[PDB]
Amino acid sequence: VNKERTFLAVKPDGVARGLVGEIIARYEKKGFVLVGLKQLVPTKDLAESHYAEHKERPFFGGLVSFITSGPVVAMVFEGKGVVASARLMIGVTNPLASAPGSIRGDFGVDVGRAIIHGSDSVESANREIALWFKPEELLTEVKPNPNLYE
Amino acid sequence: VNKERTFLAVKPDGVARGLVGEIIARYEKKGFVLVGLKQLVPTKDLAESHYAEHKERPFFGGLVSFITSGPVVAMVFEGKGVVASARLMIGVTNPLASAPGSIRGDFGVDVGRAIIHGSDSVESANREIALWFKPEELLTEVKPNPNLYE
Amino acid sequence: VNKERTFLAVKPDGVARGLVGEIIARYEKKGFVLVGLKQLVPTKDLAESHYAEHKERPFFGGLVSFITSGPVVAMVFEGKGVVASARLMIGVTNPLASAPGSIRGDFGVDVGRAIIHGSDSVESANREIALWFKPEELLTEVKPNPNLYE
Amino acid sequence: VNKERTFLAVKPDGVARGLVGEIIARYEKKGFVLVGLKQLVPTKDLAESHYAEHKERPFFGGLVSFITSGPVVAMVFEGKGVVASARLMIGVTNPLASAPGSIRGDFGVDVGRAIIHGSDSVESANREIALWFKPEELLTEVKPNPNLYE
Amino acid sequence: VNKERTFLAVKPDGVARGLVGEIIARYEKKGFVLVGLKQLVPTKDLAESHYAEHKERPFFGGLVSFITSGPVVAMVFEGKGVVASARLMIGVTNPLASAPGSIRGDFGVDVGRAIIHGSDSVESANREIALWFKPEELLTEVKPNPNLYE
Amino acid sequence: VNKERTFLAVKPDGVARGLVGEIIARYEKKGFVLVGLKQLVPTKDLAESHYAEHKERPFFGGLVSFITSGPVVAMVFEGKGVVASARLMIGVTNPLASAPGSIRGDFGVDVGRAIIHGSDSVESANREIALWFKPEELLTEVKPNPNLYE
Numbered sequence A, B, C, D, E, F: 001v002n003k004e005r006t007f008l009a010v011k012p013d014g015v016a017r018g019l020v021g022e023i024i025a026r027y028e029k030k031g032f033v034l035v036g037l038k039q040l041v042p043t044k045d046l047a048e049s050h051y052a053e054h055k056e057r058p059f060f061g062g063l064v065s066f067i068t069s070g071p072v073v074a075m076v077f078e079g080k081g082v083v084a085s086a087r088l089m090i091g092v093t094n095p096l097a098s099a100p101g102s103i104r105g106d107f108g109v110d111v112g113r114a115i116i117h118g119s120d121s122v123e124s125a126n127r128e129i130a131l132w133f134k135p136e137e138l139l140t141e142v143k144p145n146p147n148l149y150e
Ligand SMILES: Cc1cn([C@H]2C[C@H](N=[N+]=[N-])[C@@H](COP(=O)(O)OP(=O)(O)O)O2)c(=O)[nH]c1=O
Pocket: A059, A063, A092, A093, A111, A112, A113, A114, A115, A116, A117, A118, A120
């Protein structure tokens, strides 16, 4: 029952830097199956729900203004431990402190331009998924590479 | 014209082999802008209209049954000469005969498993674009990297 | 010592996923010299001796039946600290927990489909080396790139 | 009956340039299955049989002296049209006239250091295979990625 | 002979697009040695003198203006037939007509934002090498990669 | 702030191994701007003065000797926290102890053939930038990639 899922989002800086394919491929190479994928310009109301936990933090206004200043490519990968692994692959919050080899470690320098958002726990994935995805935009079931699993 | 567009779709064989990131990355590095993107499972009625021009050929069914066997990730890129460049980057119809450096030449072997589709003319791109996407699913304030165009 | 050696073997899951070139390329770029290389289908008697140290564990059979289900490409690299570096490059036992940049962290997800084997000590490399190869199957006049060593 | 095979060989310059993995991966990425693989230091008598057609040409002596001055990694790939495709992927005889994207096009400059030998026709593959490979060193049959073929 | 040389210049759009490392690496992988390298901002005298074979042409005015607008990393490579070879690796004048695998064909879209300049013949090269470099800024005699030439 | 700067030097073994393009590209992909770049052959005064914090150390003698033996492509990058960040991307002193993903960990094997030097702090950097570069060989004020900083 390795149908764990996560919500990852390439943000407007990651989008404008011509980084969408590099990020998807890191995950496809790992073994994760893409069950949902679309591009959209986030609305103020999704931007604020999405990042609800930072409503009072200073940078909030600055963050919300950004995630809606342009196209974001939202996606949800599935696979065993996909949530903690995807987080590991992204790096940490400050891109300057991310180990070389992680998405932020190889491409970011400013927390303000973090390139990609990755859900931090199953509970939040679920919240963020239902939030960005109508039920029909998600694939129900299919086969991942049979060499990944037992 | 800098706002010409083409429709591309990574096929079931491309998605499954883990080539969605690899393929998007080449159009991005080329400088093309992704103005529409989404994954889905095509329906019999979508695939027939799509490959309409081959309505009666020895392999129509086998192709219509293939493009429906799994997820496709549709996309539209915009930029100068995108339709014709996108075609050069894809290769020729038979993968084996496509040169190294092209998508079909690097990854393909069978005409049946051609990995990706690309509009062949601007008449078919405007037609195929209209076929897979809705008008609110495409971007508008589009500013490609400031160093690509003079 | 510049002539230390380790034994590595791309597993059935690695060969099948098309990772033999990717994996050899990292040891070559690292500067290690390939002094023995070959592909084969392991026999029950080869695999048991190989994974001898796990003779009695809940997953021995499933691992011995896996390493025999297809081709493995065995190899031995020589160079300073090859055994320990080769281990760092591979990752930790569980792929999900391996960091990005390492072989198991970039491509692996399951402990059962660990992609590659690496000797853990020089006692086991000399033992595993002797296990898979014959003495006339390894090189002698070995001159690594002149810019790697002082 | 797409069990066509070819014999490719990374020569001592390709070997010493740390190029073995890059070449194998180009073919694994394409869809070809590795059915045989080993490393050896070619003997004068295999060097001369192998390149029998150039016995009288001037550069012969110079070629044979080279292909035996070091390790060669011999391999045989299988797949539809693998012979003409592998040739296409290698480039032409003069590396300076090879299109960027082909093995020789991206890495060679001297016909004398051509990096890789690829059989030029089925008839010669068969001759070159039996020549470098004992029957047991070759895998008999297994499954290539099912997305490559119909 | 293998001591031929060519002048390559990564133009303002290549520099700003972050392609300097990608370009230098294609040439290094090829076998050419870097004998000169520097970043400078060109001045008019130099630009008009460099782009003299086009003085009486329509697009002229803009050529000099754009190449004077920012950083250019100039370089000269040495190698057997490096002048004709570098040009092939670059592609043709229009980036849209250039093939995937070449620099302009992989990353370019506009004739006016062609990314890199490369001498078109030996006469033009020894001339251009002289305009951008003082004789002490160029290596005298090198020890190329040992396995490149016969 | 984001106008911090660091001195990076690809050492004789990096240059000879053909890694200059790979190294420059890791930094460009990261977000840093190249403000200085040149290849030169260091002279004793410069080497001893550069490697002064090690004068009274055992390996000293050899350091100066080796870095004077061939071409070095010196460079300085500017970016937010570029000094601490470049160092992390480099790895630690011993290449065998460096992690995959870092420059030394991916390509290095010997402490004495460490491939690249990178300033260890801002004080050391502004000092070293001064030793290798004349003030006119460095860009004054740049227009970095627009989507890197907040
Ligand atoms: C701490 C902090 C975060 N942010 C941004 C970084 C994130 N962008 N993304 N993705 C976003 C959310 O912060 P976060 O949840 O602390 O970081 P993450 O979970 O590692 O992404 O705020 C900011 O702009 N300024 C700050 O001071």
